Design a binder for these strands. Structure first.
Length: 164
DNA sequence: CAGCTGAGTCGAC
DNA sequence: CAGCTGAGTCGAC
DNA sequence: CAGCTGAGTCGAC
């Protein structure tokens, strides 16, 4: 995992929570993500200050993580629309900011396999606990990403090249 | 974003 | 007007 | 396939 550990060096980690499976599947297919404006501003500021910003995805009530990815841009408004399945009470403009993301792993990891990992930045609660945008301490987030099964469909050349 | 809440005075120093 | 924020899991019942 | 069943809330954290 030396290439994987390289991508994770000095990274900041954020839990991303989706209300539906459809938007995570579209995120994996198109390499983009959108979030509410508060978390959008948080991720934009993290992108500018951190070597890498890693998003760890978990569909609400699914009992698993669905993979993780690296932010490759700040959010962009006004591009070609992403046709998200809009959660209840949310409009398309609320998710108007579109981040480009490079997926590092698109495989699943059940919460049962992460039960030994606690986040010291969230009162040492298990890493499965949190709302959208919950930040995860460096070492806890690194170990979590290393728990995912290997994704043979991922080529880390491009993400590593744009980090040089 | 978009719907929501709340918007002190008075006196010592 | 400025300030705030929702796309948490889990046990009890 | 194709006929069938079932579609928790609330509060601590």
């Amino acid at each position: 995992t030396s290439k994987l550990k390289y991508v994770l060096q000095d990274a900041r980690f954020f839990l991303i929570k989706s209300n539906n499976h459809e938007n995570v599947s579209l995120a994996k297919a198109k390499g983009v993500w959108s979030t509410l404006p508060v978390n959008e501003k948080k991720l934009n500021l993290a992108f500018r200050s951190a070597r890498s910003v890693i998003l760890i995805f978990s569909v609400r009530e699914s009992g698993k993580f669905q993979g993780f990815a690296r932010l490759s841009s700040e959010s962009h408004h006004g591009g070609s629309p992403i046709h998200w399945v809009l959660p209840a009470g949310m409009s398309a403009k609320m998710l108007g900011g579109v981040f480009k993301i490079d997926w590092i792993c698109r495989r699943e990891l059940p919460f049962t396999k992460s039960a030994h990992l606690t986040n010291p930045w969230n009162e040492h609660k298990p890493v499965k606990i949190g709302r959208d945008g919950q930040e995860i301490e460096l070492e806890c987030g690194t170990q979590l990403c290393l728990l995912f099964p290997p994704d043979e469909s991922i080529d880390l050349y491009q993400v590593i090249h744009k980090m040089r």
